[PDB]
């Protein structure tokens, strides 16, 4: 996948956003912007050019699942890759992510190596 792919990292916790942004940088992905919830995310997505979303599951105003469904049902970004992050792997949340079209699913905290594995699985599936 292109090194200049523009990521949006979504989480209401600034530290986690920084951590994910830093892991992305570690993998060579420098084009990264942040959003603090689903609403803020959708607002920033309007600037256009975004090629990948990483979103936390629980956020105020609009959570991760709500954001994911909105993106998937949106005319312009329905095919955007979306990696969902949760605090715990549960059958219910995994199946909820599957039904909504999550491109990937990962439990935090995760290493750069894990992030890389998840991104690569998504790139492969999408032919990126």
């Amino acid at each position: 996948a292109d090194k200049e792919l523009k990521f949006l990292v979504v989480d209401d916790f600034s530290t986690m956003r920084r951590i994910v942004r830093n892991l992305l940088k570690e993998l060579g992905f420098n084009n990264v912007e942040e959003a603090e919830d689903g609403v803020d995310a959708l607002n920033k997505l309007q600037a256009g050019g975004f090629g990948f979303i990483i979103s936390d599951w629980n956020m105020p105003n609009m959570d991760g699942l709500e954001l994911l469904k909105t993106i998937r049902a949106d005319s312009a970004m329905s095919a955007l890759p979306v990696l969902m992050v949760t605090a715990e792997a549960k059958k219910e949340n995994i199946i909820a992510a599957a039904q909504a079209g999550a491109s990937g699913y990962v439990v935090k905290p995760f290493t750069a190596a894990t992030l890389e594995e998840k991104l690569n699985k998504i790139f492969e599936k999408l032919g990126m």
Partner: peptide
Amino acid sequence: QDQVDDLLDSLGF
């Protein structure tokens, strides 16, 4: 874990 790990694999996650 078993089903979780299997479920994940099945979904390609």
